[PDB]
Nucleic acid binder design. Structure first.
Ligand code: SF4
Ligand code: NA
Length: 213
DNA sequence: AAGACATGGAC
DNA sequence: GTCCAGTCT
């Protein structure tokens, strides 16, 4: 694992590589964001943005989602992988927003996690992007980057990774650092072919030096 | 607690 | 024809 100063050094670099890093899921409100991120699990944004382009046209409130037949909703998001579980989760989720949260998307992370289909990653994206609540959502990219760079150990769980970053990164920068890491991993330290040769971190990166050598 | 969920894009 | 883009029971 790198030293704290090194980690901050890696993050400060990513910041310069992707100064405009942001959430790339198209949404007009917290609710649209919630649905968008739920469909985003194990799927690409381009795909999700395409589907919600029409979905948010057909649905605009939770009453709209539970109004139609489950089979209908499934069809509406059929191109999304894991669409069956997602379609079902959305209906139970909307029902709960109505029954339990006065028909609104809760601003609490743990409260969001009670919603069917919502795990820690999803809840973290939502409170951060929609309500400015500092949080570090750990997805495939964040985890890969953290491990390749030696931010934490390869055996650490997503929670452990999240706790490592929170301990290092100042609460006031958790959100933006999260997006920078996403961008860094999505457009640079990719899973299939990382751009190590021209990376400003190879000089202190374990995965990068092994990749070259 | 591994296992099932699952379409679509990048090679 | 593989590999990659979280949650639940
Ligand atoms: S050196 Fe390679 S593996 Fe390390 S962070 Fe840069 S691109 Fe990722
Ligand atoms: Na949940």
């Amino acid at each position: 694992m790198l030293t704290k100063q090194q980690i901050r050094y890696c993050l400060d670099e990513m910041a310069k590589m992707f100064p405009d890093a942001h959430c790339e899921l198209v949404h007009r409100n917290p609710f649209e964001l919630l649905i968008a991120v739920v469909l985003s699990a194990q799927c690409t944004d381009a795909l999700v943005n395409k589907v919600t382009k029409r979905l948010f046209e057909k649905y605009r409130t939770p009453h709209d989602y539970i109004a139609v037949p489950l089979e209908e909703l499934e069809q509406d998001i059929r191109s999304i992988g894991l669409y069956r579980n997602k379609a079902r989760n959305i209906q139970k989720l909307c029902a709960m927003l109505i029954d339990k949260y006065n028909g609104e998307v809760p601003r609490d992370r743990d409260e969001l996690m009670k919603l069917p289909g919502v795990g820690r990653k999803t809840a973290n994206v939502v409170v951060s992007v929609a309500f400015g609540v500092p949080a570090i959502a750990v997805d495939t990219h964040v985890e890969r980057v953290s491990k390749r760079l030696g931010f934490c150990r390869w055996d650490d769980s997503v929670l452990e990774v999240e706790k490592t970053l929170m301990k290092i990164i100042p609460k006031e920068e958790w959100s933006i650092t999260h997006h920078r890491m996403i961008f860094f991993g999505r457009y640079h330290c990719k899973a299939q072919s990382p751009q190590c040769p021209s990376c400003p971190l190879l000089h202190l990166c374990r995965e990068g030096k092994k990749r070259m050598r």
